[PDB]
Design a protein around this ligand. Structure first.
Ligand SMILES: Nc1ncnc2c1ncn2[C@@H]1O[C@H](COP(=O)(O)OP(=O)(O)NP(=O)(O)O)[C@@H](O)[C@H]1O
Ligand SMILES: [Mg+2]
Ligand SMILES: [Zn+2]
Lengths: 576, 336
């Protein structure tokens, strides 16, 4: 084996002499600068990069990659020995734990207690990432790189590093460094005075003196497309500690550098985990309307309705007499009609959204669920956005009541263990439904065709029947497009809706009077020709205010009401 | 390799017709069904779009008919002459058994998933006999698998999207047991119109009692019952416990690599013919058809033409392939 003293001096030489042609080629010696910041307590963790080491000594890099734990300890001791040379300044007292250390120094006048920094390796660029299936037992103890998806994360917990006790009789203190996942505490004083006199003094543990570190537990899983044919995906446990905590999130793609090790017992076969050293994450109105689903011919005003669904209205909030701004709409489709393309286009387009289907498949439902913590739910995962329901007509009573509760309160409840937990569901709803049998029949009402109950079905601001039928030129055009596809700016739109949705336009009393006259005349025609109700008025308000938000204007105007009126009026024509 | 090369190079006859004729020699008749089953064995091809969407390459087939018309035997034959094939019956299986079930490991003590029938058939075929006797709750499980080739599971601490890419071949019997001539196809068939829209082709089979046909059928059956294997002697009984089959397996196995491509003429033909077919369907009525014709018909035509080109090992999809494909679907949809 190597002489680790010689290796220590080599590591010191690297820290003392290396410059990356750094600070725009001024050769300011990056690690020397870092040691100054560390000495003056400006910074806690230090990521040493193995590509830098490779410039001087590739054999050292190879030495590190196998049995990495030795070199972790070695580099940490080297940094502690060199730190006073880069100090020039006295640091202000800022921590109770360090106030105890200061008192200890004042009274005196192990190193692990004082070592307030963290040292980690950034993997060499030679090492391509392995999949969770290729980290076999020949890699125990070696530095590895892995790629996958996060599934679960715990809260941050305090992990014990060194314990500090005080003695009732002799007034001394004792220390106990911790390394294994468990330990056994001290009881009676080992100091010479107490021992020689057998005076029996007891030891009291001090949470004001002992040292703790931030600790968090995580799980990571294989990508589905990487799994070989006819197999179930696997998972690996990752332990996060120190300044690496709170980076990762559930459902997020990550690449992790770490050491692969076996778990300590308390048989010859043992479980393993990955010790993390670094975590890396992987006019305007007509133009925007024409930008929605250009693959689909016609349906000009339906695209504008979906645009305003994405833009939204305003929450009025007059002292609890609430009117909400979220638009909600529903599409009734004939069998096999083009609605799937439009639906998926809005799903793809929207910056925050989710999709589900009403049949109640083997996966998790519309609401959250429990496993052995709470998780999931399409209604939950779309929150500051829009959620889309497919084949709505096949929903169950549980689904209908869940949608009803979301429409009223925009929140849900699921019982973890009998406790009445409750959970945010702030999103807008988009529904897709199909008639009970065959094509829609114009001789019968929409309730008779689609057969959802009228109470919740009438919640939607707009209802559209997507009916279509053969024609030679249109079918030929469609076939030409599909066969052509088989043979051979969203950023601006997102920024536009980002800036324009800052507006919350009001209405003046003149517009309220105008709306009053228009609404009563509309209801007169509605009963003379009924479906009209207060919901209709609030829908008009929502769509007109949404259009006012689409403009860069601080108030609604006559044209906004007129546009909303023709949109709600003409929607009936789709049913006939 | 040389045998398959010289055989395909001959080009004297339509090879696909010879291979289809030679399928399942014991079973007499049913030409179009044999041709469709051969297309299921060869398969289409996948394609992906720059928006992240993709086109399904595998084919699904359904058979409906009277008693004693050899529906079950065709399923038991495909199961023996295809790689990675699985059997299932409607009354004997559960949705959990079809997808995945939680298991307690006795070696480690841990809880983990175990694959069901449709997962094990990944990149293969699954045969469902007696399909009309399933509870609808199981059909809800089958829906996601047949549409998207994936199955979503949320059990034993795992939330996962498993792979279950497979072709479904299914058989059923009509309502009232014997098919009724005085009722429409949609009345005789017991299934929901939503589910019936997922299969690529649906065939109806009937025991038409013509003496002219009974003559050859009965003769063929009786010839089959007098055979004895050459390795067996005159009076023995067994203990309890045209293309050759070997060449057929090898030719199909090589043909599964070719990945042929569309041509402008075939695309033009399919588009024009689909428009013509749509106009004819618009004129026609539900009293004369099994189901409506839509974009799924174009996908079916493309898959079938691709498979026929694949059988030729011609790198192009040709006019001959498109013409064959449209004739097949025309027979399936527009015959009484
Ligand atoms: N054309 C045929 N060629 C060979 N055998 C045939 C033919 N037609 C019927 N059979 C016989 O029919 C018998 C029953 O076959 P089977 O596949 O069960 O029919 P089926 O249509 O599935 N009827 P069922 O299972 O009651 O719905 C077999 O023993 C075959 O020998
Ligand atoms: Mg049978
Ligand atoms: Zn003491």
């Amino acid at each position: 084996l190597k002489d680790y003293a010689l290796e220590k001096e080599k590591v010191k030489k690297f820290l003392q002499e290396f410059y990356q042609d750094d600070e725009l080629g001024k050769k300011q010696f990056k690690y020397g600068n870092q040691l100054v910041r560390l000495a003056h307590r400006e910074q806690v963790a230090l990521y040493v990069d193995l590509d830098d080491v490779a410039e001087d000594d590739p054999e050292l890099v190879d030495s590190i990659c196998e049995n990495a734990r030795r070199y972790a300890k070695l580099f940490a001791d080297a940094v502690q020995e060199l730190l006073p040379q880069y100090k020039e300044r006295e640091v202000v007292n800022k921590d109770v734990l360090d106030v105890y250390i200061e008192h200890r120094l004042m009274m005196e006048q192990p190193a692990e207690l004082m070592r307030r920094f963290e040292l980690y390796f950034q993997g060499p660029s030679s090492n391509k990432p392995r999949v969770i299936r290729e980290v076999r037992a020949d890699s125990v103890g070696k530095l590895v790189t892995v790629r996958g998806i996060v599934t679960r994360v715990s809260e941050v917990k305090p992990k014990m590093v060194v314990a500090t006790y005080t003695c009732d009789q002799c007034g001394a203190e004792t220390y106990q460094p911790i390394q294994s996942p468990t330990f056994m505490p001290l009881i009676m004083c080992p100091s010479q005075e107490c021992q020689t006199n057998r005076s029996g003094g007891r030891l009291y543990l001090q949470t004001r003196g002992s040292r703790f570190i931030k600790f968090q537990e995580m799980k990571m899983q294989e990508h589905s497309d990487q799994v070989p044919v006819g197999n179930i995906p696997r998972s690996i446990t990752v332990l996060v500690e120190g300044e690496n905590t709170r980076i990762a999130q559930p459902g997020d793609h990550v690449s992790v550098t770490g050491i692969f090790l076996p778990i300590l017992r308390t048989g010859l076969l043992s479980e393993t985990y990955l010790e993390a050293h670094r975590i890396v994450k992987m006019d305007f109105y007509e133009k925007l309307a024409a930008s929605i689903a250009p693959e689909i011919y016609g349906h000009e005003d339906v695209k504008k309705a979906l645009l305003l669904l994405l833009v939204g209205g305003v929450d009025q909030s007059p002292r609890g007499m609430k009117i909400r701004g979220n638009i909600n709409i529903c599409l009734m489709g004939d069998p096999g009609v083009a609605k799937s393309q439009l639906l998926s286009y809005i799903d793809r387009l929207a910056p925050r959204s989710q999709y589900t289907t009403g049949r109640g498949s083997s996966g998790v439902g519309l609401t959250a669920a429990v496993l052995r913590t709470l998780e999931g739910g399409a209604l939950v995962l779309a929150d500051q956005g829009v959620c889309c329901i497919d084949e709505f007509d096949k929903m169950a009573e549980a689904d209908r009541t869940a949608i009803h509760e979301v429409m009223e309160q925009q929140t849900i409840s699921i019982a973890k263990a009998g406790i009445l937990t409750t959970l945010n569901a702030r999103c807008s709803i988009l529904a897709a439904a199909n008639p009970a049998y065959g094509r829609y029949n114009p001789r019968r009402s929409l309730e008779q065709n689609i057969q959802l109950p009228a109470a919740l079905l009438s919640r939607f601001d707009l209802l559209w029947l997507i009916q279509d039928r053969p024609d030679r030129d249109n079918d030929l055009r469609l076939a030409q497009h599909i066969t052509y596809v088989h043979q051979h700016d969203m950023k601006l739109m997102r920024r536009y809706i980002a800036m324009c949705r800052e507006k919350q336009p009001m209405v003046p009393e003149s517009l309220a009077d105008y709306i009053t006259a228009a609404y009563v005349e509309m209801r007169r025609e509605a009963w003379a020709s009924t479906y009209t109700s207060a919901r209709t008025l609030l829908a008009i308000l929502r769509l007109s205010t949404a259009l006012a938000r689409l403009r860069m204007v601080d108030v609604v105007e006559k044209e906004d009401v007129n546009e909303a009126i023709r949109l709600m009026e003409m929607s009936k024509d789709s049913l006939l | 390799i040389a045998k398959i090369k010289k055989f395909s190079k001959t080009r004297s006859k339509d090879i696909f017709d010879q291979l289809a004729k030679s399928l399942a020699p014991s079973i007499h008749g049913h030409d179009y069904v044999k041709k469709a089953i051969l297309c299921l064995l060869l398969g289409g091809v996948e394609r992906d779009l720059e928006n992240g969407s993709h086109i399904r390459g595998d084919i699904n087939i359904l058979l409906i008919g009277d008693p004693s018309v050899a529906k079950s035997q065709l399923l038991r034959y495909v199961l023996c002459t295809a790689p990675r094939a699985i059997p299932t019956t409607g009354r004997g299986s559960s949705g959990v058994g079809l997808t995945a079930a939680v298991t307690t490991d006795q070696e480690t003590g841990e809880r983990r998933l175990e694959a069901g029938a449709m997962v094990l058939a990944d990149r293969g075929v699954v045969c469902i006999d007696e399909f009309d006797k399933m509870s609808d709750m199981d059909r809800t499980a089958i829906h996601e698998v047949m549409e998207q080739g994936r199955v979503t599971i949320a059990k034993a601490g795992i939330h996962a999207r498993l792979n279950a890419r497979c072709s479904v071949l299914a058989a059923a019997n009509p309502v009232y047991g014997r098919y009724d001539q005085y009722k429409t196809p949609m009345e005789n068939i017991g299934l929901q119109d939503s589910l019936l829209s997922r299969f690529d082709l649906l065939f109806i089979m009937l025991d038409q009692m013509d003496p002219e046909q009974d003559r050859e059928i009965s003769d063929h059956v009786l010839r089959m019952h007098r055979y004895r294997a050459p390795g067996e002697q005159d009076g023995d009984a067994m203990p309890l416990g045209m293309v050759s089959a070997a060449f057929m397996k090898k030719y199909i196995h090589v043909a599964k690599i070719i990945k042929p491509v569309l041509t402008q003429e075939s695309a033009t033909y399919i588009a024009e013919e689909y428009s013509r077919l749509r106009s004819q369907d618009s004129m026609s009525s539900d009293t004369a058809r099994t189901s409506p014709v839509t974009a799924r018909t174009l996908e079916t035509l493309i898959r079938l033409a691709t498979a026929h080109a694949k059988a030729r090992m011609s790198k192009t999809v040709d006019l001959q392939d498109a013409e064959e494909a449209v004739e097949l679907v025309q027979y399936a949809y527009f015959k009484k």
